[PDB]
Design an enzyme around this catalytic site. Structure first.
Site, mmCIF file in Angstrom:
data_model
loop_
_atom_site.group_PDB
_atom_site.id
_atom_site.type_symbol
_atom_site.label_atom_id
_atom_site.label_comp_id
_atom_site.label_asym_id
_atom_site.label_seq_id
_atom_site.Cartn_x
_atom_site.Cartn_y
_atom_site.Cartn_z
ATOM 1 N N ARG A 61 22.884 3.347 29.877
ATOM 2 C CA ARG A 61 23.609 2.222 29.321
ATOM 3 C C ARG A 61 22.751 1.423 28.359
ATOM 4 O O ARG A 61 23.285 0.707 27.497
ATOM 5 C CB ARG A 61 24.099 1.324 30.458
ATOM 6 C CG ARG A 61 25.020 0.213 30.045
ATOM 7 C CD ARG A 61 25.103 -0.804 31.178
ATOM 8 N NE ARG A 61 26.045 -1.887 30.894
ATOM 9 C CZ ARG A 61 27.296 -1.952 31.352
ATOM 10 N NH1 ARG A 61 27.788 -0.995 32.127
ATOM 11 N NH2 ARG A 61 28.054 -2.997 31.035
ATOM 12 N N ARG A 93 32.424 -9.278 26.266
ATOM 13 C CA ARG A 93 32.156 -7.986 26.883
ATOM 14 C C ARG A 93 31.846 -6.938 25.831
ATOM 15 O O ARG A 93 30.930 -6.125 26.005
ATOM 16 C CB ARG A 93 33.351 -7.556 27.734
ATOM 17 C CG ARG A 93 33.221 -6.185 28.346
ATOM 18 C CD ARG A 93 34.442 -5.799 29.196
ATOM 19 N NE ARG A 93 34.189 -4.590 29.994
ATOM 20 C CZ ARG A 93 35.141 -3.804 30.491
ATOM 21 N NH1 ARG A 93 36.421 -4.088 30.273
ATOM 22 N NH2 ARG A 93 34.823 -2.719 31.184
ATOM 23 N N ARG A 144 44.923 -13.011 33.314
ATOM 24 C CA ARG A 144 43.773 -13.079 34.193
ATOM 25 C C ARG A 144 42.499 -13.193 33.344
ATOM 26 O O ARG A 144 42.469 -12.819 32.172
ATOM 27 C CB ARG A 144 43.737 -11.852 35.118
ATOM 28 C CG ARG A 144 44.966 -11.683 36.070
ATOM 29 C CD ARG A 144 45.239 -12.954 36.960
ATOM 30 N NE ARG A 144 46.402 -12.838 37.866
ATOM 31 C CZ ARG A 144 46.953 -13.857 38.551
ATOM 32 N NH1 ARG A 144 46.471 -15.088 38.459
ATOM 33 N NH2 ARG A 144 48.005 -13.656 39.343
ATOM 34 N N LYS A 181 37.312 6.471 26.685
ATOM 35 C CA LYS A 181 36.274 7.298 27.285
ATOM 36 C C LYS A 181 36.646 7.716 28.700
ATOM 37 O O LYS A 181 36.389 8.852 29.109
ATOM 38 C CB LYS A 181 34.940 6.537 27.301
ATOM 39 C CG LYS A 181 33.849 7.183 28.169
ATOM 40 C CD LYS A 181 32.481 6.502 27.969
ATOM 41 C CE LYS A 181 32.283 5.338 28.950
ATOM 42 N NZ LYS A 181 31.206 4.348 28.538
ATOM 43 N N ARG A 210 47.239 -7.264 28.754
ATOM 44 C CA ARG A 210 47.892 -7.446 30.051
ATOM 45 C C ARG A 210 48.197 -8.915 30.303
ATOM 46 O O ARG A 210 47.286 -9.751 30.289
ATOM 47 C CB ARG A 210 47.005 -6.930 31.175
ATOM 48 C CG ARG A 210 47.575 -6.985 32.571
ATOM 49 C CD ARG A 210 46.597 -6.210 33.476
ATOM 50 N NE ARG A 210 46.975 -6.124 34.883
ATOM 51 C CZ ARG A 210 47.525 -5.052 35.447
ATOM 52 N NH1 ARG A 210 47.813 -3.975 34.713
ATOM 53 N NH2 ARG A 210 47.794 -5.071 36.749
HETATM 54 N N1 LIG Z 1 23.954 2.499 33.726
HETATM 55 C C1 LIG Z 1 24.101 1.248 34.213
HETATM 56 N N2 LIG Z 1 23.169 0.277 34.080
HETATM 57 C C2 LIG Z 1 23.350 -0.963 34.575
HETATM 58 N N3 LIG Z 1 24.462 -1.316 35.246
HETATM 59 C C3 LIG Z 1 25.460 -0.426 35.452
HETATM 60 C C4 LIG Z 1 25.338 0.941 34.944
HETATM 61 N N4 LIG Z 1 26.455 1.618 35.277
HETATM 62 C C5 LIG Z 1 27.234 0.744 35.974
HETATM 63 N N5 LIG Z 1 26.635 -0.464 36.053
HETATM 64 C C6 LIG Z 1 27.164 -1.649 36.749
HETATM 65 O O1 LIG Z 1 28.196 -1.172 37.616
HETATM 66 C C7 LIG Z 1 29.402 -1.860 37.262
HETATM 67 C C8 LIG Z 1 30.559 -0.927 37.571
HETATM 68 O O2 LIG Z 1 30.394 0.239 36.783
HETATM 69 P P1 LIG Z 1 31.654 0.798 35.958
HETATM 70 O O3 LIG Z 1 31.190 1.954 35.114
HETATM 71 O O4 LIG Z 1 32.821 0.894 36.920
HETATM 72 O O5 LIG Z 1 31.793 -0.542 35.069
HETATM 73 P P2 LIG Z 1 33.095 -1.192 34.367
HETATM 74 O O6 LIG Z 1 34.017 -1.888 35.345
HETATM 75 O O7 LIG Z 1 33.645 -0.249 33.318
HETATM 76 O O8 LIG Z 1 32.279 -2.389 33.659
HETATM 77 P P3 LIG Z 1 31.358 -2.247 32.339
HETATM 78 O O9 LIG Z 1 32.271 -2.670 31.214
HETATM 79 O O10 LIG Z 1 30.248 -3.243 32.602
HETATM 80 O O11 LIG Z 1 30.935 -0.798 32.234
HETATM 81 C C9 LIG Z 1 29.210 -2.251 35.795
HETATM 82 O O12 LIG Z 1 30.025 -3.331 35.341
HETATM 83 C C10 LIG Z 1 27.740 -2.617 35.746
HETATM 84 O O13 LIG Z 1 27.433 -3.958 36.174
HETATM 85 CL CL LIG Z 2 38.097 3.609 28.384
HETATM 86 CL CL LIG Z 3 48.479 -3.118 31.670
HETATM 87 MG MG LIG Z 4 31.951 1.032 32.340
#
Ligand SMILES: Nc1ncnc2c1ncn2[C@@H]1O[C@H](COP(=O)(O)OP(=O)(O)OP(=O)(O)O)[C@@H](O)[C@H]1O
Ligand SMILES: [Cl-]
Ligand SMILES: [Cl-]
Ligand SMILES: [Mg+2]
Ligand SMILES: [Cl-]
Ligand SMILES: [Mg+2]
Ligand code: NA
Ligand code: NA
Length: 214
Positions: free
Chosen positions: A89, A167, A156, A15, A123
């Protein structure tokens, strides 16, 4: 009609790459919830400090907080086509969004669990040197061993299968209801595949019918 779109996809689904390509090829605003949160945290806004309190502890932003933040960004962007990424989300986020804006297009990337899991667990690191190995793209010469030293590689915590499984289970619990919500509304477009580069042409062709190119 300006684009009112959401893109959805599990971590590791590609994505991120697809959204990046959408933004480079099409005249729209990419609205990433993570970017928005990070901009606010960087600037130390009121919502940024609150978001940081959750994120520094590994907690989701509460729905009401996240929706408030997202709607405030959208409120001054209605002259533009939009690509929401990361919001909604959860089902309460999607229902709150539905009371604010008519969402006409939801793209979902349907990539098999095993494919995602392998991507997210690939990784391995040699801690002392920081050298990086990826089981798929740059494996070590000997499984589990650093090429230069012969010493063990480790994973890690974020890259270990236990963590990744939890996750993906969380992502599924949170977002499967959102996908079903948009399916019922008749706005879901599903792209299935196992390689980002084989999925992208179909996403590209689909959006060509909906928003001008860049
Ligand atoms: N729409 C949302 N609702 C709730 N929390 C959010 C939302 N978008 C982002 N977050 C929070 O911000 C963090 C960082 O957002 P990002 O999209 O970079 O996530 P990420 O590192 O891909 O982790 P994730 O797998 O949780 O999406 C997320 O891990 C989550 O805790
Ligand atoms: Cl992705
Ligand atoms: Cl990697
Ligand atoms: Mg994300
Ligand atoms: Cl634009
Ligand atoms: Mg190598
Ligand atoms: Na962004
Ligand atoms: Na980003």
């Amino acid at each position: 009609r300006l684009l009112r779109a959401v893109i959805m996809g599990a971590p590791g689904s590609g994505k991120g790459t697809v959204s990046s390509r959408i933004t480079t090829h099409f005249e729209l605003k990419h609205l990433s919830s993570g970017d928005l949160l990070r901009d606010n945290m960087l600037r130390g806004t009121e919502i940024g400090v609150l978001a940081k309190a959750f994120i520094d502890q590994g907690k989701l932003i509460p729905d009401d907080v996240m929706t408030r933040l997202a709607l405030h960004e959208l409120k001054n962007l209605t002259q533009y086509s939009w690509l929401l990424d990361g919001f909604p989300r959860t089902l309460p986020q999607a229902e709150a969004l539905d009371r604010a804006y008519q969402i006409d297009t939801v793209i979902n990337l349907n990539v098999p669990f095993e494919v995602i899991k392998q991507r997210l667990t690939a990784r391995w690191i040699h801690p002392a040197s920081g050298r990086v190995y990826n089981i798929e793209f740059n494996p070590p010469k000997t499984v589990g061993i650093d090429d230069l030293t012969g010493e063990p590689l480790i994973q890690r915590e974020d890259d270990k299968p236990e963590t990744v499984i939890k996750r993906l289970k969380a992502y599924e619990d949170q977002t499967k209801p959102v996908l079903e919500y948009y399916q019922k509304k008749g706005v879901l477009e599903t792209f299935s595949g196992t390689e980002t580069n084989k999925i992208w042409p179909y996403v590209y062709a689909f959006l060509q019918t909906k928003v001008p190119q860049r």
